[PDB]
Symmetry: C2
Subunit: 210 residues, 2 copies
Protein backbone atom coordinates (compact mmCIF):
# COMPACT_ATOMS: atom_id res chain seq x y z
CA UNK A 1 0.00 0.00 0.00
CA UNK A 2 1.07 3.61 -0.57
CA UNK A 3 -0.28 6.88 0.76
CA UNK A 4 -1.86 10.13 -0.45
CA UNK A 5 -1.44 13.26 1.63
CA UNK A 6 -3.06 16.51 0.45
CA UNK A 7 -5.08 19.48 1.60
CA UNK A 8 -8.42 20.60 0.08
CA UNK A 9 -10.12 23.84 -0.86
CA UNK A 10 -13.41 24.14 -2.74
CA UNK A 11 -12.55 21.83 -5.66
CA UNK A 12 -12.12 18.09 -5.29
CA UNK A 13 -11.28 17.42 -8.94
CA UNK A 14 -7.48 17.67 -8.62
CA UNK A 15 -7.43 14.97 -5.94
CA UNK A 16 -9.68 12.68 -8.01
CA UNK A 17 -7.30 13.25 -10.94
CA UNK A 18 -4.31 12.33 -8.70
CA UNK A 19 -6.01 9.20 -7.45
CA UNK A 20 -6.82 8.12 -11.00
CA UNK A 21 -3.39 8.95 -12.51
CA UNK A 22 -1.48 7.06 -9.82
CA UNK A 23 -3.75 4.00 -9.70
CA UNK A 24 -5.11 4.52 -6.19
CA UNK A 25 -6.12 1.34 -4.38
CA UNK A 26 -8.88 0.93 -1.81
CA UNK A 27 -6.16 -0.23 0.65
CA UNK A 28 -3.93 2.86 0.18
CA UNK A 29 -3.92 5.50 2.92
CA UNK A 30 -5.53 8.83 2.00
CA UNK A 31 -5.10 11.66 4.49
CA UNK A 32 -6.45 15.17 3.96
CA UNK A 33 -5.57 18.08 6.23
CA UNK A 34 -7.73 21.21 6.18
CA UNK A 35 -7.74 24.44 8.17
CA UNK A 36 -10.08 24.71 11.15
CA UNK A 37 -12.93 25.64 11.00
CA UNK A 38 -13.94 23.87 7.82
CA UNK A 39 -15.83 26.41 5.74
CA UNK A 40 -18.95 25.53 3.74
CA UNK A 41 -17.15 25.43 0.38
CA UNK A 42 -14.63 22.95 1.72
CA UNK A 43 -17.33 20.84 3.44
CA UNK A 44 -19.15 20.65 0.10
CA UNK A 45 -15.99 19.57 -1.78
CA UNK A 46 -15.33 16.88 0.87
CA UNK A 47 -18.86 15.42 0.68
CA UNK A 48 -18.60 15.35 -3.15
CA UNK A 49 -15.14 13.76 -2.91
CA UNK A 50 -16.38 11.10 -0.48
CA UNK A 51 -19.29 10.19 -2.75
CA UNK A 52 -17.03 9.85 -5.81
CA UNK A 53 -14.38 7.90 -3.85
CA UNK A 54 -17.09 5.40 -2.84
CA UNK A 55 -18.24 5.03 -6.45
CA UNK A 56 -14.67 4.52 -7.68
CA UNK A 57 -13.43 2.07 -4.99
CA UNK A 58 -10.79 4.59 -3.93
CA UNK A 59 -9.17 4.84 -0.47
CA UNK A 60 -11.67 6.45 1.94
CA UNK A 61 -10.16 9.66 3.37
CA UNK A 62 -9.13 10.40 6.93
CA UNK A 63 -9.69 14.13 7.34
CA UNK A 64 -7.93 16.22 9.98
CA UNK A 65 -8.60 19.88 10.70
CA UNK A 66 -5.63 21.90 11.97
CA UNK A 67 -4.54 25.34 13.24
CA UNK A 68 -1.91 27.04 11.12
CA UNK A 69 -0.53 30.01 13.04
CA UNK A 70 3.22 29.21 13.24
CA UNK A 71 5.73 27.31 11.03
CA UNK A 72 7.16 24.90 13.61
CA UNK A 73 3.96 24.32 15.60
CA UNK A 74 2.09 23.46 12.36
CA UNK A 75 5.01 21.42 10.97
CA UNK A 76 4.89 19.30 14.15
CA UNK A 77 1.28 18.30 13.39
CA UNK A 78 2.11 17.65 9.71
CA UNK A 79 5.07 15.48 10.74
CA UNK A 80 2.85 13.51 13.17
CA UNK A 81 0.80 12.52 10.13
CA UNK A 82 3.70 11.90 7.72
CA UNK A 83 5.78 9.75 10.04
CA UNK A 84 2.80 7.31 10.18
CA UNK A 85 2.18 7.02 6.38
CA UNK A 86 3.28 4.03 4.30
CA UNK A 87 5.64 4.95 1.44
CA UNK A 88 5.68 6.34 -1.10
CA UNK A 89 3.65 9.39 -0.16
CA UNK A 90 1.84 10.85 -3.15
CA UNK A 91 0.70 14.48 -3.21
CA UNK A 92 -0.64 17.25 -5.43
CA UNK A 93 -0.11 20.85 -4.29
CA UNK A 94 -2.56 22.48 -6.68
CA UNK A 95 -5.47 22.60 -4.14
CA UNK A 96 -6.06 24.36 -0.81
CA UNK A 97 -4.19 26.77 1.40
CA UNK A 98 -0.75 27.73 0.24
CA UNK A 99 0.59 27.69 3.81
CA UNK A 100 -0.59 24.08 4.29
CA UNK A 101 0.82 22.90 0.95
CA UNK A 102 4.15 24.42 1.89
CA UNK A 103 4.22 22.50 5.19
CA UNK A 104 3.19 19.29 3.40
CA UNK A 105 6.01 19.61 0.83
CA UNK A 106 8.66 20.54 3.41
CA UNK A 107 7.49 17.77 5.82
CA UNK A 108 7.68 15.15 3.08
CA UNK A 109 11.17 16.33 2.11
CA UNK A 110 12.69 16.40 5.65
CA UNK A 111 11.00 13.09 6.54
CA UNK A 112 13.35 11.38 4.02
CA UNK A 113 10.39 9.20 2.93
CA UNK A 114 9.84 8.19 -0.69
CA UNK A 115 7.43 10.50 -2.48
CA UNK A 116 5.97 11.81 -5.70
CA UNK A 117 4.55 15.34 -5.93
CA UNK A 118 2.48 16.88 -8.73
CA UNK A 119 1.60 20.53 -9.24
CA UNK A 120 -0.85 21.37 -12.04
CA UNK A 121 -2.23 24.45 -13.82
CA UNK A 122 -4.88 25.79 -11.37
CA UNK A 123 -6.81 27.34 -14.25
CA UNK A 124 -7.57 23.92 -15.77
CA UNK A 125 -4.93 23.79 -18.53
CA UNK A 126 -3.01 20.56 -19.19
CA UNK A 127 0.45 21.68 -17.98
CA UNK A 128 1.86 19.85 -14.96
CA UNK A 129 5.15 19.42 -13.19
CA UNK A 130 6.13 16.47 -11.02
CA UNK A 131 9.16 15.39 -9.05
CA UNK A 132 10.09 12.70 -6.55
CA UNK A 133 12.53 11.90 -3.76
CA UNK A 134 15.16 10.84 -6.34
CA UNK A 135 14.89 14.26 -7.97
CA UNK A 136 15.53 16.09 -4.73
CA UNK A 137 18.29 13.67 -3.63
CA UNK A 138 20.08 14.28 -6.97
CA UNK A 139 19.88 18.04 -6.57
CA UNK A 140 20.78 18.07 -2.85
CA UNK A 141 23.64 15.59 -3.03
CA UNK A 142 27.24 16.72 -2.43
CA UNK A 143 29.14 15.33 -5.43
CA UNK A 144 32.77 14.26 -5.19
CA UNK A 145 35.54 15.95 -7.18
CA UNK A 146 35.80 12.93 -9.52
CA UNK A 147 32.01 12.80 -9.90
CA UNK A 148 31.86 16.47 -10.93
CA UNK A 149 34.78 15.97 -13.34
CA UNK A 150 32.99 13.04 -14.97
CA UNK A 151 29.70 14.96 -15.15
CA UNK A 152 31.45 18.00 -16.59
CA UNK A 153 32.98 15.90 -19.40
CA UNK A 154 29.51 14.56 -20.33
CA UNK A 155 28.25 18.16 -20.25
CA UNK A 156 30.96 19.63 -22.49
CA UNK A 157 30.83 16.78 -25.02
CA UNK A 158 27.01 16.54 -25.01
CA UNK A 159 27.67 12.86 -24.30
CA UNK A 160 30.32 10.36 -25.28
CA UNK A 161 31.04 6.62 -25.30
CA UNK A 162 32.66 4.68 -22.45
CA UNK A 163 35.94 4.07 -24.26
CA UNK A 164 36.42 7.78 -25.02
CA UNK A 165 35.22 8.90 -21.58
CA UNK A 166 37.62 6.48 -19.83
CA UNK A 167 40.60 7.88 -21.78
CA UNK A 168 39.73 11.51 -20.96
CA UNK A 169 39.31 10.77 -17.23
CA UNK A 170 42.42 8.57 -16.94
CA UNK A 171 40.23 5.70 -15.69
CA UNK A 172 39.74 2.11 -16.83
CA UNK A 173 36.60 1.14 -18.75
CA UNK A 174 35.73 -1.30 -15.94
CA UNK A 175 35.90 1.51 -13.37
CA UNK A 176 33.86 3.87 -15.55
CA UNK A 177 31.17 1.25 -16.40
CA UNK A 178 30.53 0.63 -12.68
CA UNK A 179 30.39 4.35 -11.90
CA UNK A 180 28.09 5.04 -14.87
CA UNK A 181 25.84 2.21 -13.60
CA UNK A 182 25.62 3.97 -10.20
CA UNK A 183 24.89 7.45 -11.56
CA UNK A 184 22.30 6.00 -13.97
CA UNK A 185 20.43 4.70 -10.91
CA UNK A 186 20.82 8.13 -9.33
CA UNK A 187 18.76 9.38 -12.30
CA UNK A 188 21.10 11.96 -13.82
CA UNK A 189 22.35 10.21 -16.95
CA UNK A 190 21.42 7.65 -19.60
CA UNK A 191 23.19 5.41 -22.13
CA UNK A 192 27.10 6.77 -25.50
CA UNK A 193 26.60 8.19 -22.02
CA UNK A 194 24.56 11.40 -21.78
CA UNK A 195 23.26 13.75 -19.06
CA UNK A 196 19.52 14.19 -18.91
CA UNK A 197 17.78 17.42 -17.90
CA UNK A 198 18.14 16.52 -14.21
CA UNK A 199 21.88 16.01 -14.75
CA UNK A 200 22.06 19.40 -16.51
CA UNK A 201 20.58 21.02 -13.37
CA UNK A 202 23.21 19.23 -11.29
CA UNK A 203 25.90 20.78 -13.55
CA UNK A 204 24.39 24.22 -12.97
CA UNK A 205 24.43 23.79 -9.17
CA UNK A 206 27.94 22.40 -9.14
CA UNK A 207 29.24 25.31 -11.17
CA UNK A 208 27.83 27.43 -8.32
CA UNK A 209 29.75 25.33 -5.76
CA UNK A 210 32.96 25.73 -7.78
CA UNK B 1 22.21 44.28 -0.27
CA UNK B 2 19.71 41.44 -0.28
CA UNK B 3 17.35 40.05 -2.90
CA UNK B 4 13.64 39.41 -3.37
CA UNK B 5 12.47 36.70 -5.75
CA UNK B 6 8.77 36.14 -6.31
CA UNK B 7 6.18 35.42 -8.95
CA UNK B 8 3.02 37.52 -9.42
CA UNK B 9 -0.66 36.95 -10.22
CA UNK B 10 -3.35 39.67 -10.36
CA UNK B 11 -2.70 41.17 -6.92
CA UNK B 12 0.46 43.10 -6.03
CA UNK B 13 -0.59 43.67 -2.42
CA UNK B 14 1.35 40.80 -0.89
CA UNK B 15 4.63 41.83 -2.53
CA UNK B 16 4.25 45.39 -1.30
CA UNK B 17 3.56 44.02 2.19
CA UNK B 18 6.70 41.84 1.94
CA UNK B 19 8.83 44.77 0.83
CA UNK B 20 7.50 46.92 3.69
CA UNK B 21 7.88 44.27 6.40
CA UNK B 22 11.45 43.34 5.45
CA UNK B 23 12.79 46.88 5.03
CA UNK B 24 13.38 46.72 1.27
CA UNK B 25 16.04 49.18 0.11
CA UNK B 26 16.37 50.78 -3.32
CA UNK B 27 19.70 48.92 -3.72
CA UNK B 28 18.21 45.47 -3.09
CA UNK B 29 17.65 43.20 -6.10
CA UNK B 30 13.98 42.50 -6.84
CA UNK B 31 13.26 39.84 -9.50
CA UNK B 32 9.76 38.73 -10.50
CA UNK B 33 9.10 35.78 -12.80
CA UNK B 34 5.71 35.48 -14.45
CA UNK B 35 4.19 32.91 -16.76
CA UNK B 36 4.34 33.43 -20.52
CA UNK B 37 2.20 34.73 -22.16
CA UNK B 38 1.63 37.65 -19.79
CA UNK B 39 -2.16 37.95 -19.23
CA UNK B 40 -3.85 41.37 -18.86
CA UNK B 41 -4.63 40.83 -15.12
CA UNK B 42 -0.94 40.28 -14.41
CA UNK B 43 0.11 43.11 -16.76
CA UNK B 44 -2.16 45.48 -14.77
CA UNK B 45 -0.81 44.24 -11.40
CA UNK B 46 2.77 44.76 -12.60
CA UNK B 47 2.07 48.31 -13.76
CA UNK B 48 0.41 49.14 -10.42
CA UNK B 49 3.33 47.56 -8.56
CA UNK B 50 5.91 49.51 -10.60
CA UNK B 51 4.11 52.81 -9.89
CA UNK B 52 3.92 52.09 -6.14
CA UNK B 53 7.57 50.89 -5.96
CA UNK B 54 8.72 54.21 -7.53
CA UNK B 55 6.73 56.25 -5.03
CA UNK B 56 8.07 54.28 -2.04
CA UNK B 57 11.71 54.28 -3.21
CA UNK B 58 11.68 50.47 -3.28
CA UNK B 59 13.91 48.30 -5.47
CA UNK B 60 12.82 48.49 -9.13
CA UNK B 61 11.83 45.02 -10.38
CA UNK B 62 13.51 43.02 -13.09
CA UNK B 63 10.65 41.05 -14.60
CA UNK B 64 11.12 37.85 -16.61
CA UNK B 65 8.53 35.73 -18.36
CA UNK B 66 8.93 31.95 -18.34
CA UNK B 67 7.18 29.03 -20.04
CA UNK B 68 6.44 26.24 -17.47
CA UNK B 69 5.84 22.79 -18.92
CA UNK B 70 8.38 20.41 -17.38
CA UNK B 71 10.00 20.25 -13.98
CA UNK B 72 13.66 20.22 -14.99
CA UNK B 73 13.41 22.59 -17.98
CA UNK B 74 11.64 25.17 -15.84
CA UNK B 75 13.90 24.66 -12.81
CA UNK B 76 16.88 25.33 -15.11
CA UNK B 77 15.51 28.80 -15.88
CA UNK B 78 14.70 29.46 -12.21
CA UNK B 79 18.23 28.42 -11.19
CA UNK B 80 19.75 30.74 -13.84
CA UNK B 81 18.03 33.57 -11.95
CA UNK B 82 18.72 32.31 -8.39
CA UNK B 83 22.38 31.53 -8.80
CA UNK B 84 23.01 35.22 -9.70
CA UNK B 85 21.10 36.79 -6.76
CA UNK B 86 22.88 38.36 -3.79
CA UNK B 87 22.02 36.73 -0.44
CA UNK B 88 19.86 36.38 1.48
CA UNK B 89 17.06 35.75 -0.96
CA UNK B 90 13.67 36.79 0.43
CA UNK B 91 10.47 35.29 -1.07
CA UNK B 92 6.74 35.11 -0.43
CA UNK B 93 4.82 32.19 -1.94
CA UNK B 94 1.32 33.57 -1.42
CA UNK B 95 1.03 35.09 -4.95
CA UNK B 96 0.99 33.64 -8.45
CA UNK B 97 1.01 30.25 -10.13
CA UNK B 98 1.48 27.31 -7.80
CA UNK B 99 3.87 25.52 -10.14
CA UNK B 100 6.14 28.58 -10.31
CA UNK B 101 6.12 29.01 -6.52
CA UNK B 102 7.05 25.37 -6.12
CA UNK B 103 10.04 25.80 -8.49
CA UNK B 104 11.09 28.98 -6.68
CA UNK B 105 11.07 27.27 -3.27
CA UNK B 106 12.87 24.16 -4.50
CA UNK B 107 15.40 26.27 -6.44
CA UNK B 108 16.13 28.40 -3.39
CA UNK B 109 16.57 25.28 -1.21
CA UNK B 110 18.86 23.39 -3.61
CA UNK B 111 20.93 26.54 -4.41
CA UNK B 112 22.40 26.42 -0.87
CA UNK B 113 21.93 30.22 -0.70
CA UNK B 114 20.76 31.94 2.50
CA UNK B 115 17.06 32.71 2.37
CA UNK B 116 13.85 33.57 4.20
CA UNK B 117 10.45 32.52 2.85
CA UNK B 118 7.05 33.78 3.97
CA UNK B 119 3.62 32.28 3.17
CA UNK B 120 0.50 34.17 4.18
CA UNK B 121 -3.26 33.65 4.25
CA UNK B 122 -4.43 34.21 0.65
CA UNK B 123 -7.77 35.38 2.05
CA UNK B 124 -6.08 38.44 3.56
CA UNK B 125 -6.08 37.42 7.23
CA UNK B 126 -3.16 38.05 9.59
CA UNK B 127 -1.86 34.44 9.67
CA UNK B 128 1.67 34.01 8.31
CA UNK B 129 4.36 31.34 8.52
CA UNK B 130 8.04 31.80 7.71
CA UNK B 131 11.22 29.79 7.59
CA UNK B 132 14.82 30.16 6.48
CA UNK B 133 17.90 28.21 5.36
CA UNK B 134 18.73 27.47 9.03
CA UNK B 135 15.28 25.92 9.51
CA UNK B 136 15.84 23.49 6.65
CA UNK B 137 19.48 22.80 7.53
CA UNK B 138 18.46 21.94 11.14
CA UNK B 139 15.76 19.53 9.97
CA UNK B 140 17.99 17.79 7.41
CA UNK B 141 21.09 17.56 9.56
CA UNK B 142 22.31 14.19 10.80
CA UNK B 143 22.50 14.24 14.62
CA UNK B 144 24.90 12.00 16.51
CA UNK B 145 23.94 9.65 19.32
CA UNK B 146 25.52 12.01 21.87
CA UNK B 147 23.69 14.97 20.32
CA UNK B 148 20.32 13.21 20.52
CA UNK B 149 21.02 12.29 24.17
CA UNK B 150 21.61 16.00 24.86
CA UNK B 151 18.46 17.03 23.01
CA UNK B 152 16.37 14.34 24.71
CA UNK B 153 17.71 15.39 28.11
CA UNK B 154 16.66 18.99 27.38
CA UNK B 155 13.24 17.68 26.35
CA UNK B 156 12.78 15.54 29.48
CA UNK B 157 14.12 18.22 31.87
CA UNK B 158 12.31 21.13 30.12
CA UNK B 159 15.55 23.11 30.27
CA UNK B 160 18.67 23.12 32.44
CA UNK B 161 21.88 25.04 33.09
CA UNK B 162 25.31 24.07 31.77
CA UNK B 163 26.49 23.02 35.23
CA UNK B 164 23.61 20.58 35.75
CA UNK B 165 23.81 19.28 32.16
CA UNK B 166 27.50 18.44 32.51
CA UNK B 167 26.63 16.22 35.48
CA UNK B 168 23.74 14.51 33.67
CA UNK B 169 25.68 13.81 30.45
CA UNK B 170 28.98 13.30 32.27
CA UNK B 171 30.68 15.88 30.01
CA UNK B 172 33.09 18.72 30.83
CA UNK B 173 31.50 22.18 30.95
CA UNK B 174 33.90 23.20 28.16
CA UNK B 175 32.75 20.48 25.75
CA UNK B 176 29.09 21.09 26.61
CA UNK B 177 29.37 24.87 26.23
CA UNK B 178 30.92 24.39 22.78
CA UNK B 179 28.23 21.97 21.65
CA UNK B 180 25.43 24.18 22.95
CA UNK B 181 26.90 27.21 21.19
CA UNK B 182 26.99 25.12 17.99
CA UNK B 183 23.36 23.93 18.21
CA UNK B 184 22.24 27.44 19.19
CA UNK B 185 23.76 28.66 15.92
CA UNK B 186 21.66 25.97 14.15
CA UNK B 187 18.66 27.62 15.83
CA UNK B 188 17.32 24.57 17.70
CA UNK B 189 17.90 25.68 21.27
CA UNK B 190 18.06 28.87 23.30
CA UNK B 191 19.76 30.18 26.41
CA UNK B 192 17.70 32.76 28.30
CA UNK B 193 17.06 34.53 31.57
CA UNK B 194 19.12 35.13 34.67
CA UNK B 195 19.48 31.37 35.26
CA UNK B 196 20.69 31.03 31.66
CA UNK B 197 18.91 27.68 31.31
CA UNK B 198 19.32 25.89 28.00
CA UNK B 199 16.01 24.97 26.36
CA UNK B 200 14.85 23.38 23.14
CA UNK B 201 12.78 25.62 20.96
CA UNK B 202 9.95 24.60 18.64
CA UNK B 203 12.42 23.85 15.81
CA UNK B 204 14.34 21.67 18.26
CA UNK B 205 11.11 19.79 19.07
CA UNK B 206 10.73 18.99 15.38
CA UNK B 207 14.36 17.78 15.22
CA UNK B 208 13.58 15.40 18.11
CA UNK B 209 10.41 14.22 16.40
CA UNK B 210 12.33 13.45 13.16
CA UNK B 211 15.04 11.63 15.07
CA UNK B 212 12.59 9.56 17.15
Amino acid sequence: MKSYFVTMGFNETFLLRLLNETSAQKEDSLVIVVPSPIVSGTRAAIESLRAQISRLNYPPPRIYEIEITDFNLALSKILDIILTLPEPIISDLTMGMRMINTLILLGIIVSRKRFTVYVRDEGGGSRVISFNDNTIRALMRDYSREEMKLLNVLYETKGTGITELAKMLDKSEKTLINKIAELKKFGILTQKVELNELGLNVIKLNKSVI
